[PDB]
Design an enzyme around this catalytic site. Sequence first.
Site, PDB file in Angstrom:
ATOM      1  N   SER B  48      32.989  43.253  36.422  1.00 14.69           N
ATOM      2  CA  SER B  48      33.941  44.345  36.531  1.00 14.69           C
ATOM      3  C   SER B  48      33.925  45.391  35.439  1.00 14.69           C
ATOM      4  O   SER B  48      34.637  46.399  35.650  1.00 14.69           O
ATOM      5  CB  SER B  48      35.428  43.887  36.559  1.00 14.69           C
ATOM      6  OG  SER B  48      35.460  42.813  37.571  1.00 14.69           O
ATOM      7  N   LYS B 186      38.952  46.879  29.341  1.00 11.11           N
ATOM      8  CA  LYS B 186      38.535  46.504  30.665  1.00 11.11           C
ATOM      9  C   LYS B 186      37.952  45.076  30.641  1.00 11.11           C
ATOM     10  O   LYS B 186      37.036  44.809  29.877  1.00 11.11           O
ATOM     11  CB  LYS B 186      37.475  47.494  31.154  1.00 11.11           C
ATOM     12  CG  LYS B 186      36.980  47.225  32.545  1.00 11.11           C
ATOM     13  CD  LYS B 186      38.025  47.637  33.584  1.00 11.11           C
ATOM     14  CE  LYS B 186      37.844  46.879  34.881  1.00 11.11           C
ATOM     15  NZ  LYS B 186      37.686  45.412  34.641  1.00 11.11           N
ATOM     16  N   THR B 187      38.478  44.180  31.474  1.00 11.71           N
ATOM     17  CA  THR B 187      37.966  42.804  31.556  1.00 11.71           C
ATOM     18  C   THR B 187      36.804  42.691  32.511  1.00 11.71           C
ATOM     19  O   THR B 187      36.601  43.535  33.379  1.00 11.71           O
ATOM     20  CB  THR B 187      39.044  41.832  32.045  1.00 11.71           C
ATOM     21  OG1 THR B 187      39.705  42.367  33.200  1.00 11.71           O
ATOM     22  CG2 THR B 187      40.054  41.600  30.933  1.00 11.71           C
ATOM     23  N   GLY B 188      36.057  41.593  32.393  1.00 13.18           N
ATOM     24  CA  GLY B 188      34.934  41.349  33.282  1.00 13.18           C
ATOM     25  C   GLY B 188      34.728  39.837  33.428  1.00 13.18           C
ATOM     26  O   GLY B 188      35.026  39.108  32.481  1.00 13.18           O
TER      27      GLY B 188
END
EC number: 3.5.2.6
Lengths: 247, 247
Positions: B48, B186-188
């Site tokens: 993501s 922003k996470t992933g």
Amino acid sequence: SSITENTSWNKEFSAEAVNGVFVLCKSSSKSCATNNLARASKEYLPASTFKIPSAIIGLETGVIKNEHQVFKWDGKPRAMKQWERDLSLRGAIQVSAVPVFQQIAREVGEVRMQKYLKKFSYGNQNISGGIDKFWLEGQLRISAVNQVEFLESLFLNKLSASKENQLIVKEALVTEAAPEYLVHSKTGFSGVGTESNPGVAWWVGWVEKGTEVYFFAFNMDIDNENKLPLRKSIPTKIMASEGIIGG
Amino acid sequence: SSITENTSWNKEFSAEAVNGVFVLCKSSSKSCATNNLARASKEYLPASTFKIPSAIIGLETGVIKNEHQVFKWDGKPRAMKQWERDLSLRGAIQVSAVPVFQQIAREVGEVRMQKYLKKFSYGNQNISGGIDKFWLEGQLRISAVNQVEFLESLFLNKLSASKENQLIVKEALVTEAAPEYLVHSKTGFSGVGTESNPGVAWWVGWVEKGTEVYFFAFNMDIDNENKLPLRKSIPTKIMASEGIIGG
Ligand SMILES: *C(=O)[C@@H]([C@@H]1NC(C(=O)O)=C(S[C@@H]2CN[C@@H](C(=O)N(C)C)C2)[C@@H]1C)[C@@H](C)O
Ligand SMILES: *C(=O)[C@@H]([C@@H]1NC(C(=O)O)=C(S[C@@H]2CN[C@@H](C(=O)N(C)C)C2)[C@@H]1C)[C@@H](C)O
């Protein structure tokens, strides 16, 4: 704008003994609600809420170079120790750094300032009384409904300034972030005035919550700085009760 | 970039038994620190975190109309119930709504997608494996160092896209606001892989704190969703100990 007077929020004001107004609009200024129609349209000194148009004007004229601008402290004893350091644009907005925005107004100058306030339909547009004092001590006045109309226009990128400058200022006004929402806001307090003619305290802004937007403007009479905390807590409780922010 | 390997953060990783890397740079990528130099430059699936370049590309090609674009839910079942509603751009990024970003990628198309990831210098710029799956299951890979360089270009508006679209995505990534700083992040999370071939979890962003900026990129091996909270808490603990965020 389209505004309807409410009774639902009156207890938030009379429990604290405050004389003031809250205007809350869902989606657009075609759906506003207020506890006090007449006071929603009465005009008051904007005080530090004037940092919102003035940063937009600062950017549009080139006085503020861009969003990375640093406002460097000269070494002149400032009225606040919080003003005694280099500040970013968000930082100069947050602590309502008076000398910072006084210098922006002098660099902008009277002519351009008059021009941008007419384009923005900002209040009575009266800037007499000194180019670096008119919003603090001079004749400029604006109402809670005009604040909302002004914020909505900024929100929509409809003010006469580039979209890039409008976006810079909206980001600089973020004050609360949550997974479901961002709150953009700005306080103001004109001072205590007298007990017979009190100053005004403000709290204006907008909430982007999911795909919706809520615009808001709050003002109140204030004759003692110890009543300053209600300028945010009354509006916060109202908005929490409508399910807009966590509060 | 210029990076120094460190040992004062290793305790944060070993106490939780995680194999991972944290890259933290003050001011610019000329001043970066890390716990693991080698892993800092190793390239991983972005998952993501790929919504950042993808949002910018959608805006620049006009697939995403502007910052008020709503990504309407068609009413049909999605893989996660948090995606089961209309979403704003910030909303879609926050819940990393896959179907929204798959549709965006399909309208941008292969050719434009390749052109922009060459312009952005985004990892190995390999988009084979399907135009709507490459960043999730395809051959696209990018390192922590490369993520910092990319975020720093976005911060400075140096990506090959308009300033306005870069500004829109920076504000949609705001996740934490406090009087002295904003956190943009922003996470992933690629998937659990196996015990021997773990998936990767990410947390990339930057912190504007006063007039300073700190860029960051964190990635870790993960073979169990329950370890997902570490992906924010290890880096938060490291930044809080350096005095950047107040936790
Ligand atoms: C702008 O309005 C002035 C500025 N704005 C405000 C504001 O919070 O509305 C402050 S308030 C002032 C500093 N802290 C207050 C405090 O003592 N409390 C009881 C909370 C008093 C500041 C006056 C700008 C012109 O200075
Ligand atoms: C993208 O990487 C995948 C996506 N990203 C994340 C992430 O937070 O790493 C999630 S999983 C994590 C637990 N579940 C999510 C949720 O509960 N939050 C809103 C806190 C966060 C998801 C796997 C993408 C391909 O969907």
